[PDB]
Amino acid sequence: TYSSLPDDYNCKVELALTSDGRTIVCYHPSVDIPYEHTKPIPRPDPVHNIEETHDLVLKTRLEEKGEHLEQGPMIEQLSKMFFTTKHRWYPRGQYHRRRRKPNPPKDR
Amino acid sequence: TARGTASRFLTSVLHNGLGRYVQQLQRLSFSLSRDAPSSRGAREFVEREVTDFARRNPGVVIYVNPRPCCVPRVVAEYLNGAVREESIHCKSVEEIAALVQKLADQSGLDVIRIRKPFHTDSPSIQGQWHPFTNKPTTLGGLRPREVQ
Amino acid sequence: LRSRVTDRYWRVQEVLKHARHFRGRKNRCYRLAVRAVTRAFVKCTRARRLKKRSLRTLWINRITAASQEHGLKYPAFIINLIKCQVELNRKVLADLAIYEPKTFKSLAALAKRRREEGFAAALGDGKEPDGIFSRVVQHR
Amino acid sequence: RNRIPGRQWIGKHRRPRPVSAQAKQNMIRRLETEAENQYWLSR
Amino acid sequence: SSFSKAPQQWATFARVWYLLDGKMQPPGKLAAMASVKLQGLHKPVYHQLSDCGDHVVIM
Amino acid sequence: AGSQWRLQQGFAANPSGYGPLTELPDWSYADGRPAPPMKG
Amino acid sequence: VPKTSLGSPPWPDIVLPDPVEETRHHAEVVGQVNELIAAGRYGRLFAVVHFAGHQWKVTAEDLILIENELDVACGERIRLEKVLLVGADNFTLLGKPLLGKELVRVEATVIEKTESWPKINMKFQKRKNYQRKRITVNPQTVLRINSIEIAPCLC
Amino acid sequence: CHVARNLAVEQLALSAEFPVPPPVLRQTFFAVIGALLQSSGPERTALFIRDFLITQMTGKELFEMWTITNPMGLLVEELKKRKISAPESRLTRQSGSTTALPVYFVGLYCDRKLIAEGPGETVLVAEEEAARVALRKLFGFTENRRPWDYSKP
Amino acid sequence: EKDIIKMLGLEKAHTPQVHKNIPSVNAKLKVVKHLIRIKPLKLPQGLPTEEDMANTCLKSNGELVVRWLLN
Numbered sequence: 020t021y022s023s024l025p026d027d028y029n030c031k032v033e034l035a036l037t038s039d040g041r042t043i044v045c046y047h048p049s050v051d052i053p054y055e056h057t058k059p060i061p062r063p064d065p066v067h068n069i070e071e072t073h074d075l076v077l078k079t080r081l082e083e084k085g086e087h088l089e090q091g092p093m094i095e096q097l098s099k100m101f102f103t104t105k106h107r108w109y110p111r112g113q114y115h116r117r118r119r120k121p122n123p124p125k126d127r
Numbered sequence: 128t129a130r131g132t133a134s135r136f137l138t139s140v141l142h143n144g145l146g147r148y149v150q151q152l153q154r155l156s157f158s159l160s161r162d163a164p165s166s167r168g169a170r171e172f173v174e175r176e177v178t179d180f181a182r183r184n185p186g187v188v189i190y191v192n193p194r195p196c197c198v199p200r201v202v203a204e205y206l207n208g209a210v211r212e213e214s215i216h217c218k219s220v221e222e223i224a225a226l227v228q229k230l231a232d233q234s235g236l237d238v239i240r241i242r243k244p245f246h247t248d249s250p251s252i253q254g255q256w257h258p259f260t261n262k263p264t265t266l267g268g269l270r271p272r273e274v275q
Numbered sequence: 276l277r278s279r280v281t282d283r284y285w286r287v288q289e290v291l292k293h294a295r296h297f298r299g300r301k302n303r304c305y306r307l308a309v310r311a312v313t314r315a316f317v318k319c320t321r322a323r324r325l326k327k328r329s330l331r332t333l334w335i336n337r338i339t340a341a342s343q344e345h346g347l348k349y350p351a352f353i354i355n356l357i358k359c360q361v362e363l364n365r366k367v368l369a370d371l372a373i374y375e376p377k378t379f380k381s382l383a384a385l386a387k388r389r390r391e392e393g394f395a396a397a398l399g400d401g402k403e404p405d406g407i408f409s410r411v412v413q414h415r
Numbered sequence: 416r417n418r419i420p421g422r423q424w425i426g427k428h429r430r431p432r433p434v435s436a437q438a439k440q441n442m443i444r445r446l447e448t449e450a451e452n453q454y455w456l457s458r
Numbered sequence: 459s460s461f462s463k464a465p466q467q468w469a470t471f472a473r474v475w476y477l478l479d480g481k482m483q484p485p486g487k488l489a490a491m492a493s494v495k496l497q498g499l500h501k502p503v504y505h506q507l508s509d510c511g512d513h514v515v516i517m
Numbered sequence: 518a519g520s521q522w523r524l525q526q527g528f529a530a531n532p533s534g535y536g537p538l539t540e541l542p543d544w545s546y547a548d549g550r551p552a553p554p555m556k557g
Numbered sequence: 558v559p560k561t562s563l564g565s566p567p568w569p570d571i572v573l574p575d576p577v578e579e580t581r582h583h584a585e586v587v588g589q590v591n592e593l594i595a596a597g598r599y600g601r602l603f604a605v606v607h608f609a610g611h612q613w614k615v616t617a618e619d620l621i622l623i624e625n626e627l628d629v630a631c632g633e634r635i636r637l638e639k640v641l642l643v644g645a646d647n648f649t650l651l652g653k654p655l656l657g658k659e660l661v662r663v664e665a666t667v668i669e670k671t672e673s674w675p676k677i678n679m680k681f682q683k684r685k686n687y688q689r690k691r692i693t694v695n696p697q698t699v700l701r702i703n704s705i706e707i708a709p710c711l712c
Numbered sequence: 713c714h715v716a717r718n719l720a721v722e723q724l725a726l727s728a729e730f731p732v733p734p735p736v737l738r739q740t741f742f743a744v745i746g747a748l749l750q751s752s753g754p755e756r757t758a759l760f761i762r763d764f765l766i767t768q769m770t771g772k773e774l775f776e777m778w779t780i781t782n783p784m785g786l787l788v789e790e791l792k793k794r795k796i797s798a799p800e801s802r803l804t805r806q807s808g809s810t811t812a813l814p815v816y817f818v819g820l821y822c823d824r825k826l827i828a829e830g831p832g833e834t835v836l837v838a839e840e841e842a843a844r845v846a847l848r849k850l851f852g853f854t855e856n857r858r859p860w861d862y863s864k865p
Numbered sequence: 866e867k868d869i870i871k872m873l874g875l876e877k878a879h880t881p882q883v884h885k886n887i888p889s890v891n892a893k894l895k896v897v898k899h900l901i902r903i904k905p906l907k908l909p910q911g912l913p914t915e916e917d918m919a920n921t922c923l924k925s926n927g928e929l930v931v932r933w934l935l936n
């Protein structure tokens with residue numbers, strides 16, 4: 020057994036040279052992740068807004084969540100959330116909004 | 128200029144040439160004159176090489192219209208519905224033949240800047256690279272500084 | 276015989292049609308558009324020349340990334356793929372790096388094996404030992 | 416702060432740019448080529 | 459390999475968090491790999507216009 | 518790159534020099550009949 | 558034996574296998590890949606082929622655009638002879654520097670023989686009254702790669 | 713309708729309301745198909761069908777046109793048919809869990825053997841994608857599958 | 866030096882040219898020896914005859930093969 024690169028990341032390379040010498044073959048079967056190298060799926064399900072008196076109000080207690088901030092704090096929150104700067108979330112003018120291609124080409 | 132003009136990707140009409148090749152040139156309408164000195168090349172082409180072209184390409188309908196015109200034209204209509212109007216004003220018979228052969232070989236798509244000189248549907252044979260394709264899995268799927 | 280120009284409308288439009296996507300008075304005024312369009316065309320040619328270098332640099336960077344992902348440096352990878360008479364340009368190598376991880380890993384393993392063979396040969400200084408992948412095949 | 420008087424590579428006081436090992440190797444390679452040339456031009 | 463378009467795109471352009479110990483390490487040799495991983499020069503799908511950039515946590 | 522290795526082995530310094538990658542015809546008809554020669 | 562920082566080279570020692578065992582393993586691997594090709598257990602094949610001065614990575618039902626005109630008519634099939642590399646999900650054949658025509662066969666149909674968009678080429682010199690504008694129209698061809706076949710003739 | 717409009721059937725179809733609505737275009741295209749079947753042979757008509765309708769499946773996926781709703785349910789049903797007990801979902805790889813754009817890889821293990829793996833922005837989406845990948849692998853409609861045979865038998 | 870390189874037929878760079886080994890040309894080769902690489906023309910299979918003129922090639926190591934790419 021011999022291999023230039025370790026066979027632990029996604030494929031098992033086995034190189035060979037044809038008896039003629041003019042061709043190099045390489046058999047690389049894919050590598051599957053063993054069961055011992057994984058962890059179970061975490062499941063988080065909790066309903067704390069449920070009330071024993073009025074379930075119709077309990078269902079709305081979890082849906083009536085609302086919040087509104089200013090442009091400044093909203094952009095700061097978005098920047099902290101997406102790990103970016105504040106300058107991306109500011110709008111652009113008419114000159115730049117009118118010159119965007121309406122139907123850009125698509126591949127595949 | 129690429130930034131001034133439009134662009135498109137390398138595509139084919141109805142997956143042409145995959146199952147069978149279908150000539151995209153549907154019809155070819157020549158409009159020329161019988162007495163104008165500018166339609167002389169078109170007249171000689173209609174006399175000599177329009178029948179040979181019609182026989183070589185039986186899938187294109189050729190119309191010929193002698194009319195009192197000053198600029199002889201050729202209108203190619205393709206299977207996608209594209210209309211390409213060219214002027215054969217004051218051109219030799221060889222030039223007419225070359226223009227008609229180019230129009231017959233063309234596919235009718237827009238002649239604009241092609242972004243990629245290739246077009247692959249699903250080029251991810253055997254897989255596509257993601258940041259996890261070359262990383263080893265640990266015993267238990269533990270993070271670097273995670274204690275089990 | 277007074278001769279005046281009658282097609283100046285189209286003479287101006289043929290130049291203004293290349294400036295409609297500009298900013299400022301360069302897209303309207305003719306005196307400012309002839310200069311902006313000439314610079315546009317000169318830059319178009321210079322960039323037509325520079326696009327090849329830019330794309331080759333991008334391919335080289337992608338090959339460095341895909342090689343260091345296998346613990347191999349780009350010069351070593353390239354020279355040891357050349358020494359195996361594998362004549363694949365940087366464009367094809369980057370395409371393989373992106374869409375063929377198994378093929379690129381096999382290529383990197385071949386390059387590492389060739390490098391190890393060259394190192395062992397240079398260390399031993401023996402003419403009778405010859406590596407398996409270090410054999411040179413002539414034209415047939 | 417460190418100004419070069421006059422032009423950069425003209426005056427009595429120029430830029431002190433040194434010679435690198437790459438340039439040394441290039442010159443040595445050219446010298447080897449020319450030595451082989453003057454050998455082949457001998458007989 | 460046989461993924462759908464959106465999950466394939468997500469898996470390809472996903473961000474990765476790397477850890478880096480800086481105890482008894484030279485700041486420049488740390489910054490070299492830190493900047494490489496920040497720019498995304500470790501991805502064969504890298505491009506200057508794409509937002510390919512990974513997070514680096516140096517302790 | 519690797520031009521010195523090719524010069525030592527005997528091939529051209531550029532893979533586009535008199536090698537089979539450029540001397541052979543790059544295509545032929547599906548029926549097997551030869552293609553017209555290349556201008557280069 | 559003294560062990561210092563520079564007493565040993567700063568790289569792991571490499572041990573290459575025996576040449577005889579290596580040749581036996583190569584024969585085994587080539588026979589296995591040949592059995593795979595004969596049984597036909599490969600799903601889809603891609604191929605890096607040299608054509609028109611460039612190298613193209615093409616698969617079945619592919620489209621490529623060659624920037625020069627070919628001496629063929631539209632709808633005609635063509636066998637691409639310079640195949641540098643073939644690959645599948647499980648195996649991969651590399652040429653030294655090319656593959657064998659009996660081993661691999663790539664076929665492509667000519668779709669469209671057209672002209673490129675007008676490319677502007679302008680030269681200009683400062684305050685020398687030198688401007689020069691040219692327009693290039695390049696003849697191009699479209700090739701649809703139809704099939705990439707491989708034969709079990711692999712020694 | 714795309715195939716007919718590109719083959720110029722709309723220009724030859726005799727019908728009022730020139731747009732030729734999708735039903736009328738379908739009727740005309742399949743009338744041409746029936747005329748070809750009556751004129752030439754069934755083998756040639758099948759070749760025409762394979763060349764002008766099967767080619768529209770190029771680059772397309774299986775579920776893009778099937779549009780199933782319970783991939784995991786269909787997968788466990790197919791496994792019960794193939795005499796497999798049940799697939800177990802295991803989180804193979806993940807990058808970020810508290811961030812706004814996480815990425816998870818969920819694999820499906822039957823008897824502690826990986827059959828398929830799928831990525832997603834959430835664990836549920838990753839599990840659904842893994843189920844779809846396993847379904848495609850079982851049905852044979854994969855990306856690395858044999859391309860369609862366009863030849864003359 | 867420009868004129869010597871022009872009369873030696875070395876206007877285009879990186880293209881080999883065959884010359885004699887006589888002192889007449891050796892003088893000019895010595896004059897411009899710092900701009901040229903000089904090798905001896907090797908003939909391992911002899912001089913190309915008239916039936917082998919169209920099948921010859923000049924290898925990079927300096928040898929002129931007579932039968933190049935047979936069949």
Ligand SMILES: [Mg+2]
Pocket residue numbers: none
């Ligand atoms: Mg050039």
Ligand SMILES: [Mg+2]
Pocket residue numbers: 419420421422423
């Ligand atoms: Mg100064």
Ligand SMILES: [Mg+2]
Pocket residue numbers: 419420421422423424425426427428429
């Ligand atoms: Mg000075």
Ligand SMILES: [Mg+2]
Pocket residue numbers: none
């Ligand atoms: Mg030339």
